[PDB]
Known about the structure:
Two copies of one chain form a homodimer.
Chain A: E1 4-6, E2 13-15, H1 54-71, H2 78-94, H3 101-113, E3 128-131, H4 138-153, E4 161-164, E5 176-177, E6 187-189, E7 195-197, H5 202-210, E8 225-228, E9 235-237, E10 246-248, E11 263-265, E12 269-270, E13 274-277, E14 280-282, E15 287-288, E16 291-292, H6 293-302, H7 310-317, H8 328-346, E17 351-352, H9 354-372, H10 379-382, E18 406-408
Parallel strand pairs in A: 3-4, 16-17
Antiparallel strand pairs in A: 1-2, 4-15, 5-8, 6-7, 8-9, 10-11, 12-15, 13-14, 13-18
Helix pairs in contact in A: 1-2, 6-8, 7-8
PDB class: oxidoreductase
Keywords: heme protein, oxidoreductase
Assembly: dimeric
Amino acid sequence: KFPRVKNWELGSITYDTLCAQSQQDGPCTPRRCLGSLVLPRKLQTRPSPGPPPAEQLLSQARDFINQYYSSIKRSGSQAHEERLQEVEAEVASTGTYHLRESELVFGAKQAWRNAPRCVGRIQWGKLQVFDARDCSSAQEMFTYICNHIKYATNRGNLRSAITVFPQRAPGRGDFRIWNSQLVRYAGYRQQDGSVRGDPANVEITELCIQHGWTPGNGRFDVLPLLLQAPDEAPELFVLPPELVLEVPLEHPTLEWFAALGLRWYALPAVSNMLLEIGGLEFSAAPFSGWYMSTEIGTRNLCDPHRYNILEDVAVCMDLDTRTTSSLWKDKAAVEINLAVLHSFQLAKVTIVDHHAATVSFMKHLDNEQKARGGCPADWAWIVPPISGSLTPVFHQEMVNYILSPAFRYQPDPW
Amino acid sequence: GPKFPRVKNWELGSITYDTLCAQSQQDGPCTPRRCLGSLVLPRKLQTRPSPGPPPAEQLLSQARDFINQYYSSIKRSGSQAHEERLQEVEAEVASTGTYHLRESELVFGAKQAWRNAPRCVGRIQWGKLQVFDARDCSSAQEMFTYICNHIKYATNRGNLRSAITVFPQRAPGRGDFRIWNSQLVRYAGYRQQDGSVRGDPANVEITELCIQHGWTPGNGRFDVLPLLLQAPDEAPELFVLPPELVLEVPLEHPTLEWFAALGLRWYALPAVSNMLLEIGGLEFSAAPFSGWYMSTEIGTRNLCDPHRYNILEDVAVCMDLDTRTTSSLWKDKAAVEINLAVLHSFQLAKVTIVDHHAATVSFMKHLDNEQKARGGCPADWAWIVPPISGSLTPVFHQEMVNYILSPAFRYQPDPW
Ligand code: HEM
Ligand code: HEM
Ligand SMILES: C[C@H](O)[C@H](O)[C@H]1CNc2nc(N)[nH]c(=O)c2N1
Ligand SMILES: C[C@H](O)[C@H](O)[C@H]1CNc2nc(N)[nH]c(=O)c2N1
Ligand SMILES: [Zn+2]
């Protein structure tokens, strides 16, 4: 039942007993493993044709309340039994319930802790939770978002934060941030099918223009936010420049790197995922921490379907682009990730390289084994995009499963 | 849409459906509750030893399935020869309790096992495999002759050729034919007095077994080990491979002149020998196979792994990198030059080798070929994506479905 987990670098073994607490099913079966798929339509928390069955919601709620009181050690106190009574009364009468701010804070931190694809969970206990459940308009969503950004950025000394907007109600539309991240660069599909900017943001850039945004023509034009209040069309909001801290990229030894004009924002804030706590769903709950260098230098800048700068840098470095055997791609990529670490460190902006991050994740796995008897992790996401075996996580076996609270993927509002 | 796993390529945005997984009849380690896809040896890819013959009914169903596969590949499914062969197999199983393959059935099954191997990135070459039938072999000495012939053929003075030698299958009430070594060519791993290791740390055990069996050890980092060959119901016999048979490549860097001075090297022929070839329910406990290397296997894993040669620090010190901090990316820089050295040295010595870019690109082609041919291709993402420069490679952005198909190459417990 319980999987034997092994580290091949050190020969050490552990048994994951935490996976037994999983109540939600993944995409795999004994016939075939689908663990490398980014998003199966299954785990995804899509819309519904009404209110969840009261029995199911109630059991997820009682479970969460049980988790919370256990955390503060008051498991069994009258406060626990009374909170469970309150939840039952509210659900039975209204088909739903609401969380207290202390519970929402514990829930947000626990959802991060339970996030399989996250390599920075060693910081899970240090999270600023902004309660925005008293938001009623898109204009309000914007002020809360700007507050999140100003707080998280902190002049360069980044701080992990999450802003939780109103939960989903069966009788109305969701509060949604249409942008995948709070900060994104525009992607303009040119004449020749080409793309000026970030090709990953072509669809959202089009939507922004459609809703009245006057576009630019640069490779790094920060997009405005499309915030949606229940059953209302999304509204356009331009982010104040002083709020968006950006870092111009230059290399420590290659003088010509700066000339490439590359730059990336400091704040990584995912804004399209759904936070589920005790059966309650928060369709708008942007979260942010700090970047791991490979996200920018390898994925964002070197992916073929992204900025695709590999060959440009290779030519500047004057490498042999004729054959793959010269390893020109590998050489260019290393210098690009180096430029990212150098530039952010020069600008006094928080980053963490993949070696430092993965070593900390290994410590986190150890903390978790002793604390909960395991830790759900997605090997394909945890192992960085370059120099995989050069990091300790590559040599670590991992067990992946879904625990709640959890951040889940959800359908696009359009 | 369709009731089969939807597979996507994120670089190109293309979609495909895996229908081939529908043919899988062997369960993997995963369940709807948890994914155990990253485990090297879950007890689902490993064939334990059968001290007793497989139940006639279970074996016969596996046998029928294989015969059906064979006749389908030659396009004579449902034919007279097909129904005859099926009858012939159940006749053998009826009286003897086992059966035997025809020459062409073994060649087909051996090629299909490679084709079905989820952890192999070189499957674009699956149709070109030299199958040596050694099912007549009766002694440990003969196994040696066969292995030596295999090495000569496969090595071909640098112009490597994929090959596999199949020894007699598992027989009920008789010992197995087993090659104790993990590969035909392995470097010794000497356990030092202080606790460290000289040579290859991966080979500490087998080295100790060779010593317990009469081998007189050396004291270098790259000492080729002798073979511990086992014939049925007999103790393993030690056989030293003649030096001229084992082609090696001294490592040197194209620009970093001091790299040659490091005295590093690696053998040309990658030949796995501790794996079990399962065809139609028949188990070939000894069936070494070989191809050619992918640069990262040597330069990244064998030479840079912390539990292997671990040379990253040595090379970084020579390149004068800041090994005091992670942010200098000294490990990344060094590893790149080490991989470049492996590629350069093999090309210079005219020994076949393929870099991780070329190999993965050819695996994408294979994936496209198999989509059209079988409606999918079982692939282990963790093993298909190279140990360095993952996303710079096209397979990283390719979702894969993993399942067990037979014939198959399966793990098996150590003879000892
Ligand atoms: C403290 C700094 C942190 C670092 C360095 C870090 C790093 C990472 C990395 C490398 C990824 C993969 C990103 C990608 O490839 O798209 C990731 C994903 C993720 N992280 Fe963390 N993380 C941190 C903080 C956070 C915080 C504050 C939360 C939530 C409260 C969080 C939630 C997650 C989740 C849910 C994912 C999956 C994202 C997705 O599926 O797109 N992370 N993190
Ligand atoms: C023609 C060249 C070939 C190349 C470049 C190639 C490359 C690879 C690579 C890189 C691996 C990973 C090994 C590791 O990381 O330990 C692998 C695994 C494997 N290959 Fe291939 N391969 C080729 C030929 C063969 C042949 C001839 C067979 C069999 C007839 C084969 C069967 C397999 C199997 C079953 C594995 C699994 C390894 C394990 O489970 O330990 N390959 N191959
Ligand atoms: C197909 C494959 O799952 C996909 O390319 C994954 C692999 N690992 C990843 N890992 C991280 N951190 N982020 C990603 O976007 C991906 N993409
Ligand atoms: C734990 C993890 O499965 C293990 O380190 C795997 C990862 N991917 C691999 N991939 C290949 N090709 N070869 C290996 O030996 C491994 N080891
Ligand atoms: Zn799985």
